[PDB]
Design an enzyme around this catalytic site. Sequence first.
Site, PDB file in Angstrom:
ATOM      1  N   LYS A 157      22.908  -6.233 -54.426  1.00  0.00           N
ATOM      2  CA  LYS A 157      24.146  -7.272 -54.323  1.00  0.00           C
ATOM      3  C   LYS A 157      24.706  -7.442 -55.685  1.00  0.00           C
ATOM      4  CE  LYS A 157      21.488  -9.846 -50.944  1.00  0.00           C
ATOM      5  NZ  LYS A 157      22.742  -9.846 -49.548  1.00  0.00           N
TER       6      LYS A 157
ATOM      7  N   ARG B 207      16.468  -6.649 -40.519  1.00  0.00           N
ATOM      8  CA  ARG B 207      16.417  -6.144 -39.350  1.00  0.00           C
ATOM      9  C   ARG B 207      15.296  -5.030 -39.153  1.00  0.00           C
ATOM     10  NH1 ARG B 207      22.367  -3.797 -38.609  1.00  0.00           N
ATOM     11  NH2 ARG B 207      22.534  -5.655 -40.104  1.00  0.00           N
TER      12      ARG B 207
HETATM   13  N1  LIG Z   1      26.493  -3.140 -44.626  1.00  0.00           N
HETATM   14  C1  LIG Z   1      26.102  -4.050 -44.328  1.00  0.00           C
HETATM   15  C2  LIG Z   1      26.086  -5.011 -43.261  1.00  0.00           C
HETATM   16  C3  LIG Z   1      25.321  -6.151 -43.149  1.00  0.00           C
HETATM   17  C4  LIG Z   1      24.680  -6.654 -44.345  1.00  0.00           C
HETATM   18  C5  LIG Z   1      24.011  -7.703 -44.111  1.00  0.00           C
HETATM   19  O1  LIG Z   1      23.991  -8.030 -42.917  1.00  0.00           O
HETATM   20  N2  LIG Z   1      23.699  -8.496 -45.136  1.00  0.00           N
HETATM   21  C6  LIG Z   1      22.716  -9.756 -44.906  1.00  0.00           C
HETATM   22  C7  LIG Z   1      21.440  -9.503 -45.811  1.00  0.00           C
HETATM   23  O2  LIG Z   1      21.275  -9.857 -46.874  1.00  0.00           O
HETATM   24  N3  LIG Z   1      20.574  -8.893 -44.983  1.00  0.00           N
HETATM   25  O3  LIG Z   1      19.281  -8.574 -45.207  1.00  0.00           O
HETATM   26  C8  LIG Z   1      23.408 -10.773 -45.656  1.00  0.00           C
HETATM   27  C9  LIG Z   1      24.451 -10.830 -46.689  1.00  0.00           C
HETATM   28  C10 LIG Z   1      24.859 -12.090 -47.102  1.00  0.00           C
HETATM   29  C11 LIG Z   1      24.276 -13.210 -46.536  1.00  0.00           C
HETATM   30  N4  LIG Z   1      24.827 -14.416 -47.006  1.00  0.00           N
HETATM   31  C12 LIG Z   1      24.351 -15.338 -46.460  1.00  0.00           C
HETATM   32  C13 LIG Z   1      24.928 -16.533 -47.368  1.00  0.00           C
HETATM   33  C14 LIG Z   1      25.717 -15.903 -48.156  1.00  0.00           C
HETATM   34  N5  LIG Z   1      25.494 -14.776 -48.054  1.00  0.00           N
HETATM   35  C15 LIG Z   1      23.380 -13.057 -45.703  1.00  0.00           C
HETATM   36  C16 LIG Z   1      22.747 -11.998 -45.297  1.00  0.00           C
HETATM   37  C17 LIG Z   1      24.533  -6.092 -45.500  1.00  0.00           C
HETATM   38  C18 LIG Z   1      25.472  -4.773 -45.674  1.00  0.00           C
HETATM   39 ZN   LIG Z   2      19.625  -7.740 -47.484  1.00  0.00          ZN
END
Ligand SMILES: Nc1ccc(C(=O)N[C@@H](C(=O)NO)c2ccc(-n3cccn3)cc2)cc1
Ligand SMILES: [Zn+2]
Lengths: 518, 514, 512, 95
Positions: C297, C374
């Site tokens: 991130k 997931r």
């Molecule tokens: N290519 C992709 C597609 C989806 C994701 C995704 O769903 N990321 C999630 C995550 O962290 N999953 O573990 C995600 C990203 C940001 C946030 N987020 C919540 C508050 C602010 N941001 C929540 C979930 C990541 C990469």
């Molecule tokens: Zn994640």
Amino acid sequence: SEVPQVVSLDPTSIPIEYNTPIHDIKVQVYDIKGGCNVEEGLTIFLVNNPGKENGPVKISSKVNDKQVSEFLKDENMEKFNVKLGTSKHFYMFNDNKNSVAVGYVGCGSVADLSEADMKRVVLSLVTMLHDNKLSKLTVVFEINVDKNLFRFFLETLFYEYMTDERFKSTDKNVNMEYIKHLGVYINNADTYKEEVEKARVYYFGTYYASQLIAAPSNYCNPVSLSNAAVELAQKLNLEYKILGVKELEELKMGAYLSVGKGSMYPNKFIHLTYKSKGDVKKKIALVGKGITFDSGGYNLKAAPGSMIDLMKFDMSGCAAVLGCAYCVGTLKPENVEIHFLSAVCENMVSKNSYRPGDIITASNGKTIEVGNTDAEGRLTLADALVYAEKLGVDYIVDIATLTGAMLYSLGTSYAGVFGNNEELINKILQSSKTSNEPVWWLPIINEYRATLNSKYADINQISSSVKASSIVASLFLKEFVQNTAWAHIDIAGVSWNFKARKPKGFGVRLLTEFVLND
Amino acid sequence: SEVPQVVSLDPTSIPIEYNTPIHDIKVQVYDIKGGCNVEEGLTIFLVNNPGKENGPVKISSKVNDKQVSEFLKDENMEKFNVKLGTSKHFYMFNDNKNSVAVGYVGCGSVADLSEADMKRVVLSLVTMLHDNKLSKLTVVFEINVDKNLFRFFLETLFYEYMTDERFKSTNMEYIKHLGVYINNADTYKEEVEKARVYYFGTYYASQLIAAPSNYCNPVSLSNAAVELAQKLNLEYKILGVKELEELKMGAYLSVGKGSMYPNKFIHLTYKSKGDVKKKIALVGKGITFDSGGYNLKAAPGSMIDLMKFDMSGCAAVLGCAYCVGTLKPENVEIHFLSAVCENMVSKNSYRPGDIITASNGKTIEVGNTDAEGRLTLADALVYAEKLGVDYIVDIATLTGAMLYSLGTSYAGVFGNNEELINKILQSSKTSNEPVWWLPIINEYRATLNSKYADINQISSSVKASSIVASLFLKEFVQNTAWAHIDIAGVSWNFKARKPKGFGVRLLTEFVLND
Amino acid sequence: SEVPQVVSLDPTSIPIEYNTPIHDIKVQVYDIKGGCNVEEGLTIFLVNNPGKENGPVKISSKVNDKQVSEFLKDENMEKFNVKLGTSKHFYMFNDNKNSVAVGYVGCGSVADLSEADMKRVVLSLVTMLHDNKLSKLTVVFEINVDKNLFRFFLETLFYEYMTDERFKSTDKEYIKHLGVYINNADTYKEEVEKARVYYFGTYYASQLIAAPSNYCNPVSLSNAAVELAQKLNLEYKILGVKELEELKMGAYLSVGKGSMYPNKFIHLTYKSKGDVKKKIALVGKGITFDSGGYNLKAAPGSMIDLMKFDMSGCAAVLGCAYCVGTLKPENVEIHFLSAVCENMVSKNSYRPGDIITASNGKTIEVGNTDAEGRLTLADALVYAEKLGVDYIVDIATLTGAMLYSLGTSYAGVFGNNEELINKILQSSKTSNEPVWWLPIINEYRATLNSKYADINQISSSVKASSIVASLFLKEFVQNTAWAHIDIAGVSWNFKARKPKGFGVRLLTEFVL
Amino acid sequence: VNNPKENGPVKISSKVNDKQVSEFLKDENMEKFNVKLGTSKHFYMFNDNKNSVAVGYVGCGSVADLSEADMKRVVLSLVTMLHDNKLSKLTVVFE
Ligand SMILES: Nc1ccc(C(=O)N[C@@H](C(=O)NO)c2ccc(-n3cccn3)cc2)cc1
Ligand SMILES: [Zn+2]
Ligand SMILES: Nc1ccc(C(=O)N[C@@H](C(=O)NO)c2ccc(-n3cccn3)cc2)cc1
Ligand SMILES: Nc1ccc(C(=O)N[C@@H](C(=O)NO)c2ccc(-n3cccn3)cc2)cc1
Ligand SMILES: [Zn+2]
Ligand SMILES: [Zn+2]
Ligand SMILES: [Zn+2]
Ligand SMILES: [Zn+2]
Ligand SMILES: [Zn+2]
């Protein structure tokens, strides 16, 4: 030799299928002059119409069956055209009153058919093989193709026909049923017969390399890949030697080792050798980039378009060399000594990883200032080229997914070749022509060399200014070959088939033809 | 045509220096096998040391002066090395007691010097001139150069020595004599006045490129071409909007729509005074400014402040027109073409997705308004082939991808004919303007197949934009030998913050040597 | 059980306050039909004005005080309006002549007050509590609220009043009595202690979420669940790496590979004492910290500092386990599941492109290491269905796209069973935790079709990631009613800089 | 045609008023083809009249109640055969 694990579920070997359904296919070549027999299975005519763009279909070949011959007349075929890639399927009863299948594939309006065109032809044919439970395929060549193009037809047919299901458990195919017999009708058949098993060999060499590349980085790591290379050498009867960290430390390969520092998998340098029986007249070193995964290191591939999920393919240079070792090991050329080299490691992020700005010392004494940990391919190849030149070889040819700029240079179809020798490059281009793996010559521009002048180290790893990353990288590689003919094939752009979502196994036939045609 | 103004302070013409101080320099070539005379001015020795990397300086040539000879002995000169570009010069009195300056420039350890190598030497030499108030420079060649490299030396020396002060205001005076000591001087003498011609062609183009876009616009630039053609005696014709509309150059006109300056199509012509045996059309990209249009150049590295250089292709053609008009080659008819316009943002600008129709009837779906160069060149190439020529050669700062391909030193050449390309490559060697042959990969052509138009302007997927653009251009030349030189990377000298005037010598050698 | 350390200063447990200042507050509910006594402390009237927007304040209630009644007349109150959120403080002497404090909070002009409206009412009231060293709070309801909304008033009052100071080395008077005057007081009394229960389940979830990733890790969190199960009386079992290997949970294990903290699968169980007729499995996403892995991130807006919240699903289940464990419903068996781990960058980390094998035999091609939730939920769901339940419900901060879908107020719920979803939605209305039903679009499923493995982790084209994730999850439930609540958007209260504890009350209403 | 199982074989239920095509649409012959949603094959043959007819199928998956995305995939598959064929009449049989 033992593959380290984080969990017990971590694979400890790369699954490899040696006996493919393709190898079970009996291939028979007949002369088309003796007439065609439309007995069992599917019979496909490769048809063209010179001059007439998208012209009508006319079956020239004589067919030894009154009902099939009547069906295939001109008046019936006129409704179909020979547009390149076009295919049609026919149903009919023969003289015996058996349900036979007949069809054709459009081969365009141009005589001397191209190479990309032929692939479109082959793909079109594979579509007819897929979703259909046939036992025999018969191909009738109503076009003229030289022996090289004919072998290419089978190579591509075998490769595209073959489906890789090593990693399917619950979604394996239910309807996958490969043919058991392949009939080929072509004129002057006796000259083309020799190309069949050459094609079958080239097929697996490519397919072997493809399998290694397709395997994810948790399956295909520095250890398991070296183990697979050893297993391949054992089955062929090649001299093999796998160097570990201790042996590499004594060789002072600081560039190669620095890249692998952050990995849980120890560095493994693959060195296979083929010694022809008799008067060895040419000694060749084939070097392949062997990064099982390229995260980019602390210069992490986090920028958009870095395609970090793809970087399992970063050992394609290595895979090309091993696939070649199979072809070379199987075909057994004479008067040549071939060394198959690859400095295998994994580029990862860790407390042990090497840092941007780190100065490392290569095995030739040159100190290198690291400007970007994501430029590791040239670092490993540096030590690999030193190792290669120490062998006292005539030709050094490295092949590597080295620069992403290749996507902006030649794109996805043509690979780029660099070098310090005009004759070696010309042989690569000649091998490119006959192997039917397209490669384009790019220049090593020495004016850029000054941008690699480090303030503290002997040489910079990367340039701060020059954005010609493909040429600058070659300038870097050029510094680690002192007095040996060397060519550099950048396969970053061509190695992965983005459209088919699978590897090309690029380089295997090119390198093998390079060795054979010498 | 009169250049339109927003305010009265907006310039209405491009200032051009035709009579440069370089033209006032008298060049004398002597044979080195006879000793050097170090009376007036500055004397510089070009010295190398084969084998010994960064070795000591040894002056081989005999100098006809006792006081300078003591200076140039081995014991004093050994303290200096021949590292490429390194220089030293001292001020001293000679035998008669006149203040002379003597020195050297390092030419490395390699014999066969390159052009970049030679360029670095000249730069080192020019630095001593920008710091010199005197009257004569004498260069002693203790290195090996063929006639081409020597001419390149003079071309580059003249080009780098000259300073552009048109836009300055608000410490030196140029030398009046140039002495050259080289072996077989009598064979190199023919190259002296040829170099001076090639010099201005390049420097002229440099002035056009260097000129800001408020000075150099479609109108003022077209006026300058007229001014140039008149001074040379070239047939000239400037096509305006009404004629371009009647020629139905829809791609070309769509680009200039958003500009306050009307489109101007430049057509210069040189006809030999006899039996034309080869007829050549030179087409140059003429975007006086490239904002990118609605596909605005806002992304990092888009370098919008640089985009005045986007008329460099035209500048190369005009520069060549100067050399050709001056050298007056025989048995050839040359057409100098440039579709000049400005790519701007406006209510009148053309939009992404717009389908436009070129003068050959082909419809083009615009995917990116920043790819305007190929749109203008499309109509320019159609214009050229209608002229009924043997060779059509376009030159343009077309693709930024060239910067990742060949970089800033080598330009890329594409084509549909291998013999024409070989002529360009051969021309690259003698002009010393480096070019590398790149492929037109027909496998990519399918990516230009538009759903609605006849052909796409750009590819959605394939990122080899340099090859795709060439594939696009190839669609507008049907049955004529055509070559494409992409100079986007090489056109601007980023370190020196000025234009190279690239292409002038390349194109001129192409017409002359053919 | 034992939390690994890098340095000796690294914490080995999540600090948890079970007995909050809220619990020492003695709550009294009186029926307004008999007058209010303005004895001590602060007395606040909840006032409305139907029709007029910001019209005058009229106190209907009878006050058993002559001087205060005179003070609270109409002629004196007319200068103040009932604008939603407005508050006023009054000073006066009562009949015996004691200094009492009285005031009001504007509840707008609308009858059936919403939840955002009520929160503003609650928040405005809390403001009077924070700048005052009060001893008694008395709230008089001169507005109409159903029994459910009343509980929410107390829930929100308790949760917002409470301040988390576990990680303060500094500090800086909670009330000890809460008086409530409302009509039909006898029906609302039952909601008083239920609110306190729902409150802490929520506040409990908040503490776990609010706790930093160095405090709250896979081990310390699993310890807290064990600690939680013990303070209750639930059967518990924590699966470690060795048994998870034997259950072949390859997807789940791959995510935790790069972490210094071993995977810990939480499995709490509440079994009713009679004829269990419904069996429910609550699965929570339990990533104690989400670095994103090698797909770090690092992009702007990734909000990596927030990614301690990625265990909010687990916190929601644990919060539910508390409420369920306390209220003790009958004829139900509930499994509280959470595959807890940490997604980190390491030499041991799993890579993009890696193909892993789930506990149901399906091979998965990893396209993005930041889509780890997931992967963990997949093995958790296979485990869940093996339990043989009627309903499988997972809750997780799964996709950031929810912020573009429903935003920060409404959570999204997906599923393969329409009756199960309506029960979740029905719980959303009564739990007062807003949820919106979103569709699982099967046309996108083809984008999960991997070339080599059985199924892709992520989609190449389609950007409806919340839906794509749901399509992935559906593959690990073969024949059981399953619902998925994506709470990535609603989990963190960005304005208040704290967790919401979202999901606890929703799930508890679903069970009870 | 569909097969309620997954990517299962093709079975033509309909009675065909043609001896030559019925021979083609037999179970033993159609078994080599599967009903994966969107999968298609068409063959050319002579009917009882000795006229060139074209016969084929489009897979409609294993689920009964086809969706809207499902029908589009069927239609596209059907349309591809029309774009690559100089036909005069199209006949669609809904099994
Ligand atoms: N290519 C992709 C597609 C989806 C994701 C995704 O769903 N990321 C999630 C995550 O962290 N999953 O573990 C995600 C990203 C940001 C946030 N987020 C919540 C508050 C602010 N941001 C929540 C979930 C990541 C990469
Ligand atoms: Zn994640
Ligand atoms: N400053 C620099 C200069 C060059 C590079 C570079 O060429 N990187 C290589 C690499 O990762 N080598 O190990 C590279 C990057 C991307 C790709 N790529 C190939 C298909 C898609 N991407 C290939 C090579 C990186 C950073
Ligand atoms: N979708 C596309 C594809 C290609 C281009 C492209 O090549 N653009 C040209 C351009 O704008 N020509 O007018 C371009 C871009 C950059 C440069 N450039 C040259 C020195 C630095 N930058 C030159 C040309 C733009 C958009
Ligand atoms: Zn890299
Ligand atoms: Zn790499
Ligand atoms: Zn542009
Ligand atoms: Zn431009
Ligand atoms: Zn997550």
